[PDB]
């Protein structure tokens, strides 16, 4: 978990297809709709042939999320699961002798 968190932080999952839309404004873009940016984006989407989206899924390279000893030490000496042997002494105390 800590290693995948570190890998996510390092990758940062940012800077994807920046500045896709081109600058195409024109002077006569007035005397009508004031949402011309939305219409231009609509057309830029529409000029595409079809939603291919045949992208290579292996580009992520998720296998690189490897652990390190420093990451290993993120255990931070977690609390014990068993409170104390004192609570369990009798367990073997009765079985110092052979079992019944």
């Amino acid at each position: 978990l800590k290693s995948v968190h570190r890998w996510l932080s390092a990758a940062d999952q940012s800077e994807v297809v920046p500045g896709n839309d081109n600058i195409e404004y024109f002077s006569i873009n007035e005397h009508g709709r004031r949402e011309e940016n939305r219409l231009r984006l609509k057309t830029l989407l529409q000029q595409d042939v079809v939603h291919e989206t045949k992208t290579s899924t292996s580009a992520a390279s998720e296998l690189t999320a490897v652990v390190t000893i420093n990451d290993l030490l993120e255990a931070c000496q977690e609390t014990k699961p068993s409170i104390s042997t004192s609570e369990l002494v009798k367990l073997r105390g009765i079985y110092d002798r052979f079992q019944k």
């Binding site: 978990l1 995948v4 996510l8 999952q13 989407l45 529409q46 079809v50 939603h51 992520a60 998720e62």
Partner: protein
């Protein structure tokens, strides 16, 4: 020329523009497993009705039947409603109470837990990572239902 096949009317039919098949596919075509023919025929219907109702003078004349994405969305809502009787299907009958991203501190946790199993909010495939649900707890009558519809319709797709 599937639309045109037997609609023997004066002029053929087409869309020719402006529709976005990804929107139609994603918006509510889930659980419309087949008989999209219903959808497309209802679209043809709305379009043809809007056409023929035109007067002879009318100030303008349409040359051919054209389907628009707005009527198609209307038709898909209608179809989902009329399917509701066949099989129970929630709707969006909510007014003036939606997408309050700043409603509370709880929203951030909701978003940061709904995201990881999904690609577009979080690239990781959640292979070894444990996927989990969300449980809300507290007095009744103070937010347990509207949150669900809001989240479903704003970030998820189906409810």
């Amino acid at each position: 020329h599937e639309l045109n096949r037997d609609v023997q009317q004066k002029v053929p039919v087409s869309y020719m523009d402006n529709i976005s098949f990804s929107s139609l596919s994603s918006y509510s075509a889930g659980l419309t497993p087949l008989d999209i023919k219903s959808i497309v025929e209802t679209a043809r219907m709305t379009a043809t009705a809007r056409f023929y109702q035109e007067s002879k003078k009318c100030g303008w004349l349409p040359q051919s039947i054209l389907i628009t994405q707005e009527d198609l969305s209307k038709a898909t809502s209608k179809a989902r409603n009329e399917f509701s009787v066949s099989i129970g299907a929630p709707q969006i009958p909510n007014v003036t109470w939606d997408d309050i991203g700043g409603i509370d501190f709880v929203k951030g946790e909701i978003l940061d837990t709904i995201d990881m199993p999904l690609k577009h909010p979080e690239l990781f495939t959640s292979g070894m990572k444990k996927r989990s649900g969300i449980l809300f707890y507290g007095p009744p009558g103070t937010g347990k239902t509207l949150m669900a519809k809001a989240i479903a319709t704003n970030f998820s797709l189906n409810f």
